Design a protein around this motif. Sequence first.
Motif, PDB file in Angstrom:
ATOM      1  N   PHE B  60       0.833  -1.397  -0.054  1.00  0.00           N
ATOM      2  CA  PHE B  60      -0.053   0.017   0.129  1.00  0.00           C
ATOM      3  C   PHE B  60       0.848   1.154   0.082  1.00  0.00           C
ATOM      4  O   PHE B  60       0.754   2.227  -0.714  1.00  0.00           O
ATOM      5  N   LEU B  61       1.966   1.406   0.619  1.00  0.00           N
ATOM      6  CA  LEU B  61       2.814   2.415   0.854  1.00  0.00           C
ATOM      7  C   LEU B  61       3.530   2.836  -0.483  1.00  0.00           C
ATOM      8  O   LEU B  61       3.640   3.936  -0.694  1.00  0.00           O
ATOM      9  N   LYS B  63       2.655   2.832  -3.538  1.00  0.00           N
ATOM     10  CA  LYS B  63       1.345   3.148  -4.575  1.00  0.00           C
ATOM     11  C   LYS B  63       1.037   1.981  -5.276  1.00  0.00           C
ATOM     12  O   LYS B  63       0.078   2.339  -6.098  1.00  0.00           O
ATOM     13  N   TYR B  65      -1.401  -0.139  -5.404  1.00  0.00           N
ATOM     14  CA  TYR B  65      -2.641  -0.294  -4.540  1.00  0.00           C
ATOM     15  C   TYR B  65      -3.429  -1.638  -5.028  1.00  0.00           C
ATOM     16  O   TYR B  65      -3.840  -1.945  -3.951  1.00  0.00           O
TER      17      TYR B  65
END
Lengths: 121, 124
Positions: B60-61, B63, B65
């Motif tokens: 998630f961190l 990008k 997603y």
Amino acid sequence: ALSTIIQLQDCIQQAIQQLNYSTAEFLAELLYAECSILDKSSVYWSDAVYLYALSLFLNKSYHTAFQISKEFKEYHLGIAYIFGRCALQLSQGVNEAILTLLSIINVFSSNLNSNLVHIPD
Amino acid sequence: DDQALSTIIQLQDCIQQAIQQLNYSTAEFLAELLYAECSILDKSSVYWSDAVYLYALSLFLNKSYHTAFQISKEFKEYHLGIAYIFGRCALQLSQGVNEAILTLLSIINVFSMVLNSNLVHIPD
């Protein structure tokens, strides 16, 4: 009235630690505005500048944190680090970040202890 | 087995340390390594859940997603942080929001499986 700003800075720490972004924007700006008037060289001023710059950098606002850290990069190491990372992101002002980070490296080399969140070792 | 637990613990501390600084690619590789290593251990043990949560957070961190969304969707019920990552991915992509609701409503109502943990970014 330092207890209130200490409490709000701790609240900022907790908020950014909770992976909550744009929550720390308002609080970081509040700290910046409150601490810009009391002093321009106190430790709290540098702390507020660093926390603010972190908040703008982590919330997809680089063209502002860029200059904000540029003005006071020489005061705190975290501000210089934020400046350098934003310079890498925006591909601007690389030389000034190089000079500031070389200078902090020589200070360690030659014969700074803030424990705030996300502060690099 | 004596040193097997030590390696997993050391790896977990390494990922927490890497995430603490603004160093994300190293966190990506380390979380990937822990997730791959934890495959042998059974799904009941906590270590699999913590490794999956750390991997989902790192994805998630960075990008990426979609990958984080899929990984968290796989094991969304096991851990609370996995559900948090699922909710963040759902808001970011507007995909599978209903499953996120059916998970978060249950997790919030039950509180007031694994629910609490010492890891980084464990939501309150």
